[PDB]
Amino acid sequence: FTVMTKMPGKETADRNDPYGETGFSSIKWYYGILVKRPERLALIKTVAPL
Amino acid sequence: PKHYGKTIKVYEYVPLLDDRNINDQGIDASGATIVNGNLYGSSKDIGNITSKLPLLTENGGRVNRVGFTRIAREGSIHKFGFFYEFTQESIDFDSDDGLM
Amino acid sequence: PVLKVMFHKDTNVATVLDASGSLSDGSVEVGTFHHPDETYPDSVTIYHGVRDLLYKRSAKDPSQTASYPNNIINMQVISIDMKATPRLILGTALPRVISTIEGKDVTWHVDVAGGKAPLTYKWQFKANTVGAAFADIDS
């Protein structure tokens, strides 16, 4: 997980917002899967009681 | 402590994905505004999870927003008491010692 | 599918609606764009298209056009409401290759989400022989 944080103040000052009262924080990542033998997985679909 | 009334309050912090988290800060993955701040509530349907999945490219800006909410509780204090009354002739002339 | 964009100056709202649709709230037309980009279907979403469309128009009057310093370049205040039909996506895809022996039943399943409501399905088949084209399977 990659996290980026910019608290409001001088660093967030911009030509759009000269005062820079705003700020943000973000998170991002990658994910993938490779299945070698799908025949080994199993499943039984059914209803369930209340 | 004294001088603070008769009540106490605290804060509970609701998790991100609980249904109780309700707010207007949500922004959908497409960039359009959405009613729900949390990605999906306490929903275990595969359709909702599949539809509402965060997604970004290499340079990402303003895609998915979330929000948070807190709740508070209370307590209070009461008072009780009782008494009884007697006379000196009763204790002095009683046949039983140590009645008190 | 081509989409059409309306902008309301007072509330700073950009509305994306289908081409035939119209709005009577008092907004003006900024432009049109393709929701699935013809060159890059998956790289660009609605937000980028709306931003590129609004870059051209002028800040003081949404109808007129202006250069960079007077553009509408701040999308923190701009909010997007989607009224067009959601895009069709293929959640489940058919297997690329199926192998079997003669006399065994074969089943194909496809799952599609989005679109309007009366989504229909039609299946087509081609033979291996040379000069063969897709033929409809008789329902």
Side-chain angles (χ1 to χ4, degrees):
Chain A
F1 298 122
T2 313
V3 298
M4 294 177 70
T5 307
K6 287 192 182 177
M7 300 266 258
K10 184 183 177 180
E11 60 186 1
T12 61
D14 200 23
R15 35 188 54 95
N16 298 355
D17 184 24
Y19 315 111
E21 302 301 84
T22 61
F24 71 99
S25 179
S26 63
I27 190 167
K28 64 184 287 185
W29 69 88
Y30 266 93
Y31 164 81
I33 191 167
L34 163 64
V35 62
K36 272 140 183 181
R37 274 164 272 222
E39 191 86 350
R40 296 200 161 178
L41 301 161
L43 196 76
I44 296 170
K45 298 185 187 175
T46 180
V47 295
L50 202 165
Chain B
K2 174 92 181 103
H3 300 289
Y4 280 83
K6 298 181 180 181
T7 61
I8 295 174
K9 324 292 261 173
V10 299
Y11 281 125
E12 311 186 12
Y13 276 109
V14 161
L16 202 173
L17 291 174
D18 219 351
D19 280 327
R20 293 188 297 273
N21 204 57
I22 310 180
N23 57 7
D24 290 331
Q25 289 203 348
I27 291 188
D28 187 74
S30 176
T33 188
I34 179 64
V35 63
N36 290 318
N38 44 4
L39 277 296
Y40 54 92
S42 68
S43 178
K44 314 183 141 43
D45 202 56
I46 206 67
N48 304 337
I49 304 184
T50 305
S51 64
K52 290 171 296 188
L53 269 185
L55 294 174
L56 263 72
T57 184
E58 179 173 357
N59 314 299
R62 303 203 61 83
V63 193
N64 277 298
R65 276 206 305 183
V66 301
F68 309 90
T69 301
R70 59 191 179 188
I71 55 175
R73 317 297 203 93
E74 66 182 1
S76 58
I77 298 196
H78 295 89
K79 189 179 184 181
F80 319 94
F82 53 99
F83 65 91
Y84 75 94
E85 184 177 0
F86 52 87
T87 51
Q88 195 177 10
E89 71 206 50
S90 172
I91 53 179
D92 291 331
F93 289 108
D94 211 49
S95 79
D96 191 0
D97 190 20
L99 183 68
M100 320 285 318
Chain C
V2 181
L3 301 187
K4 178 185 103 74
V5 187
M6 310 303 287
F7 184 65
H8 195 266
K9 186 171 42 143
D10 310 336
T11 55
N12 286 341
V13 176
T15 311
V16 184
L17 73 164
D18 189 358
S20 60
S22 60
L23 264 180
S24 57
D25 70 17
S27 298
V28 297
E29 322 176 319
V30 176
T32 50
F33 74 100
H34 291 97
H35 183 187
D37 189 46
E38 302 164 345
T39 42
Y40 319 114
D42 262 0
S43 294
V44 176
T45 186
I46 300 168
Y47 162 78
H48 306 97
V50 168
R51 172 193 60 185
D52 278 301
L53 260 184
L54 278 178
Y55 194 110
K56 293 152 152 63
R57 274 311 201 300
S58 175
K60 61 175 72 176
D61 282 15
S63 296
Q64 305 152 354
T65 60
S67 296
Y68 156 75
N70 296 65
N71 280 168
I72 300 155
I73 59 172
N74 184 30
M75 290 266 176
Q76 198 177 29
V77 288
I78 307 298
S79 305
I80 304 177
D81 302 297
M82 179 95 185
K83 312 281 182 213
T85 59
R87 184 251 291 271
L88 287 170
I89 62 170
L90 205 65
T92 305
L94 297 179
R96 181 67 184 91
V97 178
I98 304 187
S99 177
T100 190
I101 206 176
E102 301 196 0
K104 272 205 71 161
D105 271 3
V106 189
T107 306
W108 295 267
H109 187 70
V110 66
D111 191 329
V112 185
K116 183 52 63 180
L119 278 56
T120 64
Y121 308 92
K122 185 162 31 73
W123 285 85
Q124 294 177 357
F125 165 63
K126 179 218 308 183
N128 265 334
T129 69
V130 304
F134 272 19
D136 203 329
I137 297 195
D138 187 75
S139 59

